Amino acid sequence: EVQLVESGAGLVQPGGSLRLSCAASGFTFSDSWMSWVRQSPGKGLEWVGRIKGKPDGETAAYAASVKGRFSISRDDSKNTLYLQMNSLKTEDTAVYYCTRDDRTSCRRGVCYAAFHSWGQGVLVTVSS
Amino acid sequence: YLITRQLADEPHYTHELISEPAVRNFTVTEKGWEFVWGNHPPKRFWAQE
């Protein structure tokens, strides 16, 4: 049982800064593709981001709506996945889920990984 | 065995035992084309304009 706990959500002064965190335990952390997803009212699940492992450079691919605003910065000193959201809009609010991405086929170097695990989820309230 | 037809009135069926490396240039209309090659599942292709 991989363990994942979302933290740091609540109410915000919109158009600004905010942080969420996922305090993981249950897998080899520094060799783990991890990702985020968000669920909206009336709209399904959007992928937000995927971070890569130390054997690739801790790179982070993002989504369209979030380039330059959302940034992932993990650290191996503490098993914890950060997301420092910036310049909050009115649709960015959604129930976030930290996830682990197990790679299941590596075809010619570039690998492909689904979303295995999930957190309990946390509510981000962007309003005024 | 190469097993090909069309999904129209005139299927124009081909049953050819390929044993050496071959190349085959078929035709594919808007109605259909089928492709069965050995023990694989059937594939089925259509053409858009």
Place this chain on the structure above:
Amino acid sequence: YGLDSSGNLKGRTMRYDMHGTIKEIPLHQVSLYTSRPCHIVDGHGYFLLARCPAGDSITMEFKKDSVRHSCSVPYEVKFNPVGRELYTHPPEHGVEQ
């Protein structure tokens, strides 16, 4: 195949009449081939299962310490593979049909 000279049950022996009298051979000494050798699986009653390849005949043979009893017959053994790929010997892997 599957009995003794006295009628009691026994697993992998064959009984056969030589000039009036029944004998026994264990089945691990009774060979047969078509083109290249076969491999006896099992035997029961008159009938004998085998795992033979394709060929133009069957020759089945045994020995009893000085003799070589063989019998060859021009009955065709066919290898009729499954599916739209024509094998003469099965693969280590594939799909099921």
Place this chain on the structure above:
Amino acid sequence: STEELFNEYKLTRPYMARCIRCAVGSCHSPIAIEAVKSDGHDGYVRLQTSSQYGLDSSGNLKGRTMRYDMHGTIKEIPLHQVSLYTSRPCHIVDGHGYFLLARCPAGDSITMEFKKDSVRHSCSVPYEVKFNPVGRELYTHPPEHGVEQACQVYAHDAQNRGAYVEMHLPGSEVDSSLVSLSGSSVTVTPPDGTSALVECETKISETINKTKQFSQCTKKEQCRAYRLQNDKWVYNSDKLPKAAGATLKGKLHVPFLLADGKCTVPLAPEPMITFGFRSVSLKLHPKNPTYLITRQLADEPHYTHELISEPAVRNFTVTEKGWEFVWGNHPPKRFWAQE
């Protein structure tokens, strides 16, 4: 001597692996054929097997004996009791390590078998064995006489020319004989010297040496015992499992490689050449199939290359410029006309 090329194989051990037609159904045979190679010319082929060659049951140097595994314990027999056939019987030439040099003819499949006390161990793999003749005349069994041309053949040498296969750990090997039921418990009984891992259903244990009884387990269909050797090394087989950590513990030199040399190819009968005005009539009487390779020595050579296998009569034309003729492995023969 023959000791310096076993300084890595001695640290190995043979293994058991699946094959599909053993003697009755699919089985974990100990003479599994991981690979077969027949890129050489004159029937010589190379079998990468699970069994070892040139060693004994413990590692000590023995000459011409094969060394196999049987349900955990290494056993041995000589080599003259092993037989392998493709379609006709082969003829084992030599063995070294995981590898075996044989002189097999062409076939669809290759079968390898032997007999120890009363069983008939056998393994058959669908690996096509290719007789690849040398030259322009295409033979099936090489000749009593002819001419020596170049050839590449799988050599009898066991030296290190530079090829290598891997050698890493074996995976933990399961053994249901270790586990039994003592009426009420599950009894784990490892062999003396090595340890056993027990996975039941919960516990994961590492028994050194003790006939241990486990409660919380009624039947032995639940528990699984894995033998822990972790001392001798193996080829990266696709039919053994893989241990955890590193799994790369050396290299092993590949014997009996493709070496250049000389091989006798047959000469055909000398054809009967009837001269005519701008005409050569070749009466070609072959013995085996033979190539007919001819050209004109001008800008447009009109290259002819025909396989011939029956008595032929072929009438060709010869200009003032010339005409080359090659029947089989005979040397070139040139002709010119004159007015």
Place this chain on the structure above:
Amino acid sequence: EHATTMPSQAGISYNTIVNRAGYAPLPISITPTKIKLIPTVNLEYVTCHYKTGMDSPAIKCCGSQECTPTYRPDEQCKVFTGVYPFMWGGAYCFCDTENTQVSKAYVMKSDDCLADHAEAYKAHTASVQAFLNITVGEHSIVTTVYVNGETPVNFNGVKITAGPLSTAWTPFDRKIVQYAGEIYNYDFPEYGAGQPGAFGDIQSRTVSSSDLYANTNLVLQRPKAGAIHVPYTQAPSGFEQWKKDKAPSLKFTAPFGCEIYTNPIRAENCAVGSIPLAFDIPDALFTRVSETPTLSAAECTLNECVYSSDFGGIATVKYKSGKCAVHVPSGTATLKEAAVATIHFSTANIHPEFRLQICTSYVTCKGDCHPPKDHIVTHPQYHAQTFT
């Protein structure tokens, strides 16, 4: 009573409207997921290999014998004179002449004739069938209809007499053979015209029967001097020959995209034929006059346009706030949905001029579609073509 006509094809949503005074149009959305053709099949016979039964010889010693016509399949009996047979313990007789050997050979069927046997068939009077996700006013129920006319369904008010099919086509001929899960088409001989060499060397009316017809050109022959054997020269089995000489059955050779299956005999998804319908819709499922919102101004906007097989189009409208029923009169735009914002459609027109229609009224929509990107696809056209 709404009447209409549909293309018989899987995965093709058909969306129609009932325009009548007072009340509003109704979107009727149908999605046939399986279109099947089960015929009537009478078994004629079955056939497998044969087993040349050679009852043992009577050897008469220094005397004669006479045959006896025991009625067995392909029975053949004959008396030979002048034999001198050997056995392991020596010869059998002291009269060289005046001996006799009576041979008797017959043709019983294989012992494996329960698993390896082809069963022949006469076929006729096809019966077509369908599984529909009918939708009449948010009723996405699923059900089954035998398209034969008087085979009504009745779920809610409306009754639907789907039927007939507009063609009597079958891929299945009158004469059919079943073997190895595959249905060949073959003109097998009837029960008695089984010629030697081909399909019909053995004919049994069924499998567990006891009546067998065998014509195998069976002809005995003399035994060699010093041997006890009943030889013969028969026509080879036509079953093995049919197997060595067959074209692939119908799953690989049938037209109209039929998918043939064998428990029971069927040909599904045969993309051919028009299926008519007839809808007797009551007046309880219509309500407009002031119930469906009206009087809006959201005229038309287009966003993406591509004349492709898939729904290559995105058009948007800028607007009470109730569910309307959308439909294009013509074939230049096949709307995905049938009710409502934006729409999604498919077209073969380079410059569409489709008038989108709301329950209130109709609005004009014009654009210019691009070509599609990849020009082989794995889905059939969701739209029918038009001249220009």
Place this chain on the structure above:
Amino acid sequence: PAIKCCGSQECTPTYRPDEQCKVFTGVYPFMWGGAYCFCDTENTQVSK
């Protein structure tokens, strides 16, 4: 192969020629000493 009993596995890159990798789930394999894993599902296999 790396067979994990009643758990899971992750592939890993090894930049070799035409390096295919695939993880599998639902295997109940045999060695000479009987079955390897015991959980019917939840077994795993890696083919590289």
Place this chain on the structure above:
Amino acid sequence: DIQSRTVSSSDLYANTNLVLQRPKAGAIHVPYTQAPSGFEQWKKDKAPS
């Protein structure tokens, strides 16, 4: 299909269409389906030298 700069290199371009497959239930094997050796085919049907 196999391209190596020199005989003593470390890198090699390999496009053989190696496609792994599902293993048979009750067996430990790494099945594959790929294209055969183009070198061998060339060695069969090549123009005479």
Place this chain on the structure above:
Amino acid sequence: DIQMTQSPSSLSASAGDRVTLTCRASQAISFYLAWYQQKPGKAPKRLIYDASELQGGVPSRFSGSGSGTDFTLSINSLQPEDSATYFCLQYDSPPFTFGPGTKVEIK
């Protein structure tokens, strides 16, 4: 962005029956589809990955089959613990798009 469609959107049924679901794709994704599941106010759950490999923990009455642009999700036996919204995932080319969902309900 590979705009999917998670069709149907309402495929209710009763116990013991069989049901299917489709997540069709524009571009040709080889086998990298993942059918997931979601419940009221809880997190999702990986059901099938690679379209043919059932996750460890999922009862066998679910099953996968498909390739390219067309896929399936066959429930051989819909017991009443399956009141849930089912999704589909694409992980061959970013963005990692999902289908909207299908709201499998029961009574």
